[PDB]
Each structure stands twice: as C-alpha cells, then as structure tokens.
Amino acid sequence: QRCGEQGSNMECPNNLCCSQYGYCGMGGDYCGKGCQNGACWTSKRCGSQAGGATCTNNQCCSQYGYCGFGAEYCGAGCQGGPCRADIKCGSQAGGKLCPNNLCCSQWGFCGLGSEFCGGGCQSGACSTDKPCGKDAGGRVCTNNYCCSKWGSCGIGPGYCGAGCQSGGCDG
Amino acid sequence: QRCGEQGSNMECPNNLCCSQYGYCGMGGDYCGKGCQNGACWTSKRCGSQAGGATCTNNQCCSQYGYCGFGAEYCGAGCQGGPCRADIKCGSQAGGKLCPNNLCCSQWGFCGLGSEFCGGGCQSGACSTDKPCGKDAGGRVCTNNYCCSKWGSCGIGPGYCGAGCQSGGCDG
C-alpha cells in the first residue's frame, strides 16, 4: 500500500503521484515537492543527462533528458521508455537487450505481448521459460536474471536465494 | 510491500510481474498464472473490447483490445496508453478527457510533463493547481477530483475528506 522508497519502489496505478511520504494521490501534496513517481509536477531526469537512469512508470525520456509522454518525449529523439520509433535488439542488433524487461522478439524488436515474449523471444520477459545452468549445460540467463535451483530464470527470493546457479544472485 | 489487489493496485517497478500473491519479481512464479500487473504472460484486455478498461503500467491498448508495447500495440488503431498517434483531448475533441490522468495541453494533446501539465493545461494532472470551490466562484475540478476545504484539486484524504467541497468526496 506504500509507494516509492517506503514501498520498495512500487509505483501507483494510473499515474497517481507517490508523495514524499510514500502515499499515492493527486494534487500538490502528492505531485509537488518530493513526489517520488507518477505525474510529478517536476519531471524526474533520465537518459544520458542523468547518466543512463530510466524513467518511472514507463515514461518516455526526451532528447533533453526529461520524463513524460506525448510527441515531445516519445517522438523524435526519445532516449528510452516506449518511444515512437521501433526499438531493435538481440541477434539483429549486436546482441542489445531491451530496457525495462521488455521482450526482444524472434524478429529483433522490443515489446510486450505474445508476439514478442512467445516462441522465439530472445531476452527479457520471455513466456518460453527455458531452462538454465546445470541440467541445461551451464546455460546462463538473459538479462542476468537468476537461475534458480531448478535451472529456471527469474528474480525474487526463489531465483536469487539459496541454490542460485547463475547471474544476479543474492551473495 | 505488496502489489496488485493486495497492495491497493500498486504496480512493480520496471515491468516486473506482480504474482497472485502480491509480490514483485520475474519468472513463471510471478508472470505465469494469476499475474496481476507488469510483464504478465497473459496480456490483459482493454479498450472497447473490454468496455473501457485501461492497461496497467502505461501499456498500449491495441486495436484488438490487448495490452503490450511495440508497433502492434501502440501503432495504428492504438486505443490508449502511449499510442504513436498524438491523442486529442479537451476543447479540440469536444471536452474529452485524456486517459489515466494524463494532462490535456492547451493545444489539445495528451501527455505528461511541463508542455502538457503547465500553463493552459485543460484537464488531468495539471501542475497549475488552479483554485476551485467557494472561493473560486464554485469552479469544480476536472476529472471529478476533490475540491478540498482550501480550494485545491487533488485525490486523497486531505482533499476528499473533511470539508471536501465538490468531486469524489468521501461519504
């Protein structure tokens, strides 16, 4: 029920503003001073300008390094988030990965949905759930997900915890 | 702490799936069956096909009424989220509201950021904080936001509670 730092960086629904206090709402108390995510009155910084930082809430990072939506952000120059240009990846783009866990399709484009995540998906949130590590010949994971104890890719206590075969383990 | 139904529709950072248990992570335990938001393996329905329901995580609602990112979801016939087309609103669209609290700019386009939410913002999360209520000749807020006892528009207990003047006041 908490958002931002107080709620493990959780984001509010429907672009509600996460106040300084870790509560979702709308109006000055939430979006004004200290707003952590959502439609903050002051746009958070991103992309080169903030040295590669992502925008919260799938916002577009403009050519000037500001977070938002609309042509100004998502259009010409967009540096991240759901940009209007088609985003290339995988084998077709020198092995690049999609930002924010997007699935790299069999064709080499970044998205979400079964066309991207389904059979052939190369990296990110694939729905294919292909085995990793030991019982699958030292096969890591894309994105540095953790290869559980079952040679299963993911993130969370169960993949990064104890028995963690590869990637981003918890120690 | 929790996301989804368990955490007031709280969403996970970076497209992580919210499992049926209200926790954020990645893999088939979070994204598989019962996933609530983020990169779910089963895309939610939206738009006309699902009687106006909007996607979580600012995903695009395709022409076919499925949530996702990429050209098939945000391109032609996109019905919501950060569509590739400039989305019309406000006067320039007969008073229509932008979805998900987005700002309606002065020129009648939906977005987030100064250029949309600042000076001339018509509806949504404007940051101009124009006064409402008794002291502002009884103007009501757009979007059914609450007019607090002090003449400010927002959503939260300070706005919708004790002394709320108009909008979705608590009762």
Partner: peptide
C-alpha cells in the same frame, strides 16, 4: 503470437 486462451 499464440498462447493463453483469448476469447473471440
């Protein structure tokens, strides 16, 4: 593009 049952 297929998997999971979509109504039609």
């Amino acid at each position: 593009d297929t998997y999971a049952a979509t109504p039609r």
